[PDB]
Design an enzyme around this catalytic site. Sequence first.
Site, short mmCIF file in Angstrom:
data_model
loop_
_atom_site.label_atom_id
_atom_site.label_comp_id
_atom_site.label_asym_id
_atom_site.label_seq_id
_atom_site.Cartn_x
_atom_site.Cartn_y
_atom_site.Cartn_z
N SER D 140 0.92 -1.15 -0.11
CA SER D 140 0.07 0.19 -0.08
C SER D 140 1.09 1.31 -0.06
CB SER D 140 -0.83 0.05 1.05
OG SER D 140 -0.39 0.26 2.26
N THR D 145 1.72 0.05 7.53
CA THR D 145 3.09 -0.61 7.64
C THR D 145 3.59 -1.24 6.60
OG1 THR D 145 2.06 -2.59 8.35
CG2 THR D 145 2.64 -0.82 10.26
N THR D 179 -7.59 9.28 4.84
CA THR D 179 -7.59 8.32 6.01
C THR D 179 -6.36 8.35 6.90
OG1 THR D 179 -6.55 6.60 4.88
CG2 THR D 179 -9.26 6.78 4.54
N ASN D 206 -10.12 2.85 -4.01
CA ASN D 206 -11.51 2.43 -3.18
C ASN D 206 -12.49 3.45 -3.44
OD1 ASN D 206 -10.21 4.25 -1.80
ND2 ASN D 206 -9.86 2.91 -0.22
N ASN D 228 -12.35 -6.74 -1.81
CA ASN D 228 -11.46 -7.58 -2.10
C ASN D 228 -11.88 -8.94 -2.95
OD1 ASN D 228 -10.22 -5.85 -0.22
ND2 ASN D 228 -10.99 -7.22 1.51
N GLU D 254 4.66 -11.06 -22.62
CA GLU D 254 3.96 -10.29 -23.61
C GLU D 254 3.40 -8.65 -23.19
OE1 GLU D 254 4.65 -13.20 -23.70
OE2 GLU D 254 4.82 -13.89 -25.55
N1 LIG Z 1 -5.24 -3.33 0.85
C1 LIG Z 1 -6.14 -2.70 1.86
N2 LIG Z 1 -6.18 -1.45 2.03
C2 LIG Z 1 -6.97 -0.84 2.82
C3 LIG Z 1 -8.02 -1.76 3.48
N3 LIG Z 1 -8.97 -0.75 4.13
C4 LIG Z 1 -8.43 0.47 4.05
N4 LIG Z 1 -7.29 0.35 3.16
C5 LIG Z 1 -6.60 1.44 2.94
O1 LIG Z 1 -5.38 0.97 2.74
C6 LIG Z 1 -4.22 1.33 3.57
C7 LIG Z 1 -3.68 0.17 4.34
O2 LIG Z 1 -2.32 0.74 4.88
P1 LIG Z 1 -1.93 0.69 6.37
O3 LIG Z 1 -3.45 1.08 7.10
O4 LIG Z 1 -0.95 1.51 6.90
O5 LIG Z 1 -1.74 -0.90 7.01
P2 LIG Z 1 -0.32 -1.34 7.31
O6 LIG Z 1 0.79 -0.73 6.81
O7 LIG Z 1 -0.36 -2.83 6.90
O8 LIG Z 1 -0.21 -1.05 9.01
P3 LIG Z 1 -0.96 -0.33 10.23
O9 LIG Z 1 0.02 0.66 10.74
O10 LIG Z 1 -1.41 -1.26 11.24
O11 LIG Z 1 -2.03 0.30 9.53
C8 LIG Z 1 -4.96 2.30 4.70
O12 LIG Z 1 -4.39 3.40 4.97
C9 LIG Z 1 -6.27 2.52 4.05
O13 LIG Z 1 -6.33 3.78 3.47
C10 LIG Z 1 -8.02 -3.30 3.08
O14 LIG Z 1 -8.77 -3.61 3.47
N5 LIG Z 1 -6.93 -3.56 2.10
#
Ligand SMILES: Nc1nc2c(ncn2[C@@H]2O[C@H](COP(=O)(O)OP(=O)(O)OP(=O)(O)O)[C@@H](O)[C@H]2O)c(=O)[nH]1
EC number: 3.6.5.-
Lengths: 178, 185, 438, 438, 32, 50, 37
Positions: D140, D145, D179, D206, D228, D254
């Site tokens: 992301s 994180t 967010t 999204n 998802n 390709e």
């Molecule tokens: N891929 C994904 N993104 C989401 C989802 N829901 C919200 N998001 C967006 O995707 C981003 C995910 O990044 P983070 O929130 O930093 O998650 P992370 O880096 O794995 O770890 P955290 O610090 O705990 O949040 C969020 O900032 C949301 O804006 C989801 O279910 N899947």
Amino acid sequence: TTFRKCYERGDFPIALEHDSKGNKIAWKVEIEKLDYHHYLPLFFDGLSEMTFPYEFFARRGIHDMLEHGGNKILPVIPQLIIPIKNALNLRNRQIICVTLKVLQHLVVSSEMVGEALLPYYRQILPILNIFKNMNQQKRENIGDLIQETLEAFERYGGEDAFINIKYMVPTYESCLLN
Amino acid sequence: MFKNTFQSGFLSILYSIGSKPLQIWDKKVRNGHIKRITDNDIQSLVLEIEGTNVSTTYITCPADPKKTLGIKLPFLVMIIKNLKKYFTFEVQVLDDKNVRRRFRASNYQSTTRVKPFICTMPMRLDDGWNQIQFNLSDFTRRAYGTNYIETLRVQIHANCRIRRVYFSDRLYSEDELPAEFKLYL
Amino acid sequence: MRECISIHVGQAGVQIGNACWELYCLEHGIQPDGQMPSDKTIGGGDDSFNTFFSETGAGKHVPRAVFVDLEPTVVDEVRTGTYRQLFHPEQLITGKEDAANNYARGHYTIGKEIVDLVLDRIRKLADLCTGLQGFLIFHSFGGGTGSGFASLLMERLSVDYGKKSKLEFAIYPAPQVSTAVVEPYNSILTTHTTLEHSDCAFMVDNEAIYDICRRNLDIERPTYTNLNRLIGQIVSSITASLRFDGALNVDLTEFQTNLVPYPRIHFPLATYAPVISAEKAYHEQLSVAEITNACFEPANQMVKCDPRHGKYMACCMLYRGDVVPKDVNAAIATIKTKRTIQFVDWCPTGFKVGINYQPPTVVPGGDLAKVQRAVCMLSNTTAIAEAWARLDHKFDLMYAKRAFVHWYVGEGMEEGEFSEAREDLAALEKDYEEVGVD
Amino acid sequence: MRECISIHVGQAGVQIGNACWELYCLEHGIQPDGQMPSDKTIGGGDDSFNTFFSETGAGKHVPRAVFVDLEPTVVDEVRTGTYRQLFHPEQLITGKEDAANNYARGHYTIGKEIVDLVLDRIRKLADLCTGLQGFLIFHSFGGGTGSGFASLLMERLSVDYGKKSKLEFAIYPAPQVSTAVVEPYNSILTTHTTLEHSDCAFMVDNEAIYDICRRNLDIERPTYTNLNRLIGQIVSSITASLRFDGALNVDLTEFQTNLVPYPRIHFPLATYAPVISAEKAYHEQLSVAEITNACFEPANQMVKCDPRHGKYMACCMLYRGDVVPKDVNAAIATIKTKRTIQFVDWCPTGFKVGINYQPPTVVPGGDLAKVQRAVCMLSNTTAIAEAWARLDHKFDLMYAKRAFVHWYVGEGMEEGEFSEAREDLAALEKDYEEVGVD
Amino acid sequence: EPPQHPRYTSLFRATIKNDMKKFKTAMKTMGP
Amino acid sequence: RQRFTKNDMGDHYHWKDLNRGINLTVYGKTFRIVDCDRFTQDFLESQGIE
Amino acid sequence: KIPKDDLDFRLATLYNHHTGAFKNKTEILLHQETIED
Ligand SMILES: Nc1nc2c(ncn2[C@@H]2O[C@H](COP(=O)(O)OP(=O)(O)OP(=O)(O)O)[C@@H](O)[C@H]2O)c(=O)[nH]1
Ligand SMILES: Nc1nc2c(ncn2[C@@H]2O[C@H](COP(=O)(O)OP(=O)(O)OP(=O)(O)O)[C@@H](O)[C@H]2O)c(=O)[nH]1
């Protein structure tokens, strides 16, 4: 090699003479009451050696104790065997010519030699067997020296001497009954 | 080391009156000392090597382990004063086969041990200033049946009172010895 | 035939032998009672068992082992445990004292009046054996009591029988963990008394297997039960070549000859690759390439050594499990291609492969896995000298302040043994580095 | 044979992968046990499933995906779910700390002590696999994180493997939804860190997914379950070419070749055409011409960029189901004759078409329709710059007042790197401006 | 010196910068 | 240890065909079955071989 | 570069297995300037 460093360190009291273009030598300590066992094959390593001025010592002294030391070679023969075949594998025309000469003198030097040499042909001969015929100013014809060696050898060697020499050498001929 | 020099004659390796005699002798001091002090009988300075443990403290030759000794003479003589203590020494040589071998003369040794790389010998002797004599070819011939060729290193341990180590081709008599060799009390 | 004798000494030495003899009843299905189920294996006693257990016509397998100790606690608990009906009654020899960690106390004071009986028992085992390749010795360097007694036994067995090999297993002193500071002393005594008559010694350490148990077996609080189980698996895997067969067969005489190069240095190091939990191996895969890479994996060796620091000189592998030869030799060829592992320039071949197909056995209530492929690797290298360096630079200081020596001198030893030992140790390290030198 | 790896990072980057495998199990008939019915189907992992599953002789199809996270919550919950029996245990990699949305914290403070283990897993799959055509990395940009950790591991794999493709897919920074306020910072940092190593990256929004779900899916209160699910059908559509066959097939090579003209700009857009409610599909019809009209419709795209703002370079069309060359080429001829869409003049032909027979699949308890003619569309165009422009000035204003730079400098970083990132994104832009200009 | 690249006025500065403010009436609707 | 060949093709004596009172030729020498032991008949009747 | 687990574990550990003890997995496998130090 090992003998060259052995003398470069030094344990052999041998003197010399020399002039414009020819040859002569002397020595300092006599050989008969020094040794024919602890030093004979080590000095013989000079035969396999090929480097000035060491080859002078080798080529001559090898003759020298041969004339001066007959009734002692008896047990040292297996030790003598090794540098012979080492030099043979070294594969140099001049070196092997010098060998052939000194080995000729070796066999003719004294008695008992061929009969004790009975176990000790299958290592010296076959390389010569293949040296037979690849090819009098200074006795240079490899093949002539080869046939001279075989001639001086077989009659003095004994009875099956010739047949085993033959088994080495498919050309080989009798000098006895032909 | 100095192979180019002449094995002929006599080879004093260490001799006490030398001003700085410790070049080729690496020292391993541990719970002990090196001291340079006169005696009463010769009333001349000699070396004193002592330590709590003898394996900890020991002198050796050559100083560079990446260098050999390079000596042909098979006779060795050491001038030692017994000190009623635990001393030993070690010599390593190269032989007719070109495999290395060690000799370990230890004063304590209760038995005689032959190991394929090293021989051991007990040392027992009198007190006061006395002498060491050994023949490399003799011992190698007797034990390993091989033939001594050259020396490569030598090490000496503690509990000892030192005047000179020297080497010779043969068993020399008492009269060709120089006056400093002709020890007097 | 291919039969031998098991010798166990020391209360630490006995629980491991107990576990081993358990795992030996397991695979042939010897019931703890002493006789088989209704299915038939008994007679004159001639099959895979006639090598470990003597089941003569009486119908009871008699294990060809003897356990001895000085403290009656452990020997009586095993006298009262589960397998007592199986253990021969006076094959469990007991003393009434402890050696108080004093090597010479265990050697001179009490050993004199027990060696007679133990040698009597071993000779009466000799009469019943036919070939008797030899003895499997179980003991420890820092033998809290058994060290001196075992050294004496080994010497007298050497002086009477010089025509059979000796394979021995002692638990190496923990390099930085000390259970008592008398261990360097009794250890070095054992070393100097054993190195010259011992045939093939394999060292094992407890810290490393502990860290393995937490590492990949993933058990934070392991036990003797677990560790003894694993080492019993080790010895069973080695003796599998004896019991069963496969493509080819190998033997202890080969082990010593091909492994030990010279006199003196006969001290190889052990590894067993596929240590893993049942749940892990349940849905992960195992094959020859990765298991061999594991057996070279530094965490998998049970000696505190750096094979990077050292250099390799000999290796044997015994492969217990359903396998094929090609991929084996292909993987070993890839190892030969590898660079960082530094074999010495002496043996362009340095491997002893052995094949056996019978799967390694599992134990009830165990923490191993349902193995189908396993390799146990033995290797002799040059990186162990640093451990001896460690132990000597620990020894020296306490010897210098001559601590506790009153015990030994009062019981009747002198300094000369210690003297001897210190230069023997120096000699060992120096020859190691010399043969390391090309 | 044909196969690829999958890596999942970021706390929210993992439920989508959860969904993807919860999908794949269906169409390959995998049960959450990991076992087939009694029909002869097992080997080393060599059949239809072999492209993404290694089902060793233990009969369990192992997903070729590693799920890493810095926090234990979601990972341990899914470990408590209904697939932990399936998954490789430590292939779920755990940390014990968050990152709090700071790129440099994760990229510097903690990342260095987990990257080792994850690289170990990467290679211990890369050993048993054979073809290894590439990777699928899920992360992301505005990472909770994800940002720094993904960047650093991407750099390590880019410098360790120069002979394979890489795929980078993610949710994009929402145009107008914030967010997390440090989103501009982390986004621009990741963009610069990837521009010089990235192969192909897809960006989705999204908000636009939400909008489509509202518009035509007949749903008004949606969740990540639905969203998802959608990204999962996307990944299924792209991997169908490898999963099965057709009249003609195409490969990741390709797309790599035929989609990106130059270095630098290699970031397309995607669209799934037949998104429809069940009853709507029940009472209307679908076929090639109309579905292609719908796919090129501007609003059904999932990025807030109007195509009429720019012009097209290239397009790829992947058709799943049962269609024919005749009508597909006729329809695309009509498309080209149409005047609205504007193709840049370099390549009058700009179309890459491909076919697979297998119909798209319906998931139990899902919300899709009973589709028989799916088509995914990939487009490389010029309208994309709008999002970049929208982000850059938020970046520059928060840079102007210099807030939370205290956070960053406190965790040990300097401003010149953000300075760099500014003109770096500007250079990417000027690349776009030239390529758009004719 | 690398000269600063002009922020491209592909609308945006013109359009989107104005729209983001024009579609707002906040700071009002919870009362003065 | 090996598997055994019933007929020419390469078949294998699957326990699905063995019962009491059966003879069989195996690499020449032919044998006859007399009787079995506890777990054997228990398992075999659990299958249900009469 | 690295072909597999072999060269990984043998090249980059710094865990002088004689020196260390009572450590954990992650600590066991640790690289060098390869990572940043
Ligand atoms: N891929 C994904 N993104 C989401 C989802 N829901 C919200 N998001 C967006 O995707 C981003 C995910 O990044 P983070 O929130 O930093 O998650 P992370 O880096 O794995 O770890 P955290 O610090 O705990 O949040 C969020 O900032 C949301 O804006 C989801 O279910 N899947
Ligand atoms: N063989 C073995 N050793 C163990 C076990 N657990 C711990 N040890 C170690 O084994 C060593 C035991 O040696 P000793 O204590 O001298 O044993 P001993 O000489 O037979 O006599 P005791 O001192 O009374 O036990 C200890 O140092 C422990 O560190 C085990 O299960 N088996």
